[PDB]
Design a protein around this ligand. Structure first.
Ligand SMILES: *[C@@H]1O[C@H](CO)[C@@H](O)[C@H](O)[C@H]1NC(C)=O
Lengths: 56, 49
């Protein structure tokens, strides 16, 4: 529920009608397929909120 | 407010209850179907006064 957006170096997800940038995460994004198909896809990390808890 | 046209059509797809990956994964087919459908407008008006 947003757009992917960049300040020039970092990538954020934003609500579409008001600038409020959030860290790109498994929970504000969804997967479909692989990078071969989409015209203009970009390489950036996506954060997983389970992992730093499971690393405890 | 500018937005890339393929991203505008991805919003138009959410607005009809189709998930936006359906457009990005079918984008060239959707553009071909659109360009073909505009071509039929020329033919219909260039014949059916
Ligand atoms: C935008 O167009 C450039 C060429 O001017 C192309 O290299 C690039 O992949 C395109 N990016 C997107 C997001 O479509």
């Amino acid at each position: 529920e947003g757009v992917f957006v960049s300040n020039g170096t970092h990538w954020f997800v934003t609500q579409r009608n008001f600038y409020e940038p959030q860290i790109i995460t498994t929970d504000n994004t969804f997967v479909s397929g692989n990078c071969d198909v989409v015209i203009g896809i970009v390489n950036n990390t996506v954060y997983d909120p389970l992992q730093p808890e499971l690393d405890s | 407010l500018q937005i890339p046209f393929a991203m505008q059509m991805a919003y138009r797809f959410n607005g009809i209850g189709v998930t936006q990956n359906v457009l990005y994964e079918n984008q060239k087919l959707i553009a071909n179907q659109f360009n073909s459908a505009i071509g039929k407008i020329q033919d219909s008006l260039s014949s059916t006064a």
